[PDB]
């Protein structure tokens, strides 16, 4: 699983991506639990999650080889 970070979260984690090897599918909720366990310093940050470039919900599934991105509140335009 490839995890992509943007904007303030990227700044806080000091990294733009990372790989997490997965043996099996994971729920989006499970992904967030893991993320906040590893990185308590983002645990109050607001964001949506995209999986393979589509917005998902917490009840969706992530497959082992998916790309997952944290999308903070957008400010383009």
């Amino acid at each position: 699983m490839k995890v992509l970070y943007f904007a303030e979260i990227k700044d806080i984690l000091q990294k733009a991506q990372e790989d997490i090897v997965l043996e099996q599918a994971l729920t989006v909720q499970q992904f967030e639990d893991l993320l906040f366990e590893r990185y308590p310093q983002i645990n109050n940050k607001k964001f949506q999650v995209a999986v393979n470039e589509e917005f998902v919900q917490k009840s969706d599934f992530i497959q082992p080889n998916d790309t997952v991105a944290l999308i903070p509140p957008v400010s383009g335009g």
Binding site: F6, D11, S75, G76
Partner: protein, 137 residues
């Protein structure tokens, strides 16, 4: 290499987006550019840094194009957003809409900029003298 819906890092070259949207049935083109402003705060803005999740951002710009086609058939839309550092008065975003008649070109264009602010994964950071802050919404 120009795409209809794209993210660029180089300064936006404006004429190609109008040209993309033009054909012999179109009598109106509306081109909106969003520019970096100075003096929105008390402390001078030095410049902005934009970021995007580029492949998703380009897919969401195309989605807006498709929404426009559904609401104002007959329009043609092209959109670019720039990322990286942007100076004062640099174009951050450009939207070009063509139409046989002007009213749809104005409406569709104004719709586009609203949607970009709503859904497209692009972020700005303001940089000032001894500080910087990612903007939200």
């Amino acid at each position: 290499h120009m795409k209809q819906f794209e993210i660029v890092i180089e300064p936006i070259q404006t004429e190609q987006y109008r040209e993309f949207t033009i054909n012999e049935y179109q009598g109106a083109v509306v081109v909106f550019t969003g520019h970096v402003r100075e003096w929105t705060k008390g402390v001078k803005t030095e410049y902005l840094e934009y970021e995007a999740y580029i492949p998703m951002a380009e897919k969401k710009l195309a989605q807006i194009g498709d929404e426009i086609n559904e609401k104002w058939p007959g329009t043609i839309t092209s959109i670019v957003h720039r990322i990286g550092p942007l100076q004062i008065s640099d174009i951050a975003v450009l939207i070009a809409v063509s139409s046989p008649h002007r009213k749809d070109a104005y409406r569709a264009n104004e719709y586009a900029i609203e949607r970009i602010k709503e859904i497209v994964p692009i972020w700005k950071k303001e940089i000032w003298e001894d500080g910087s802050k990612w903007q939200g919404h």
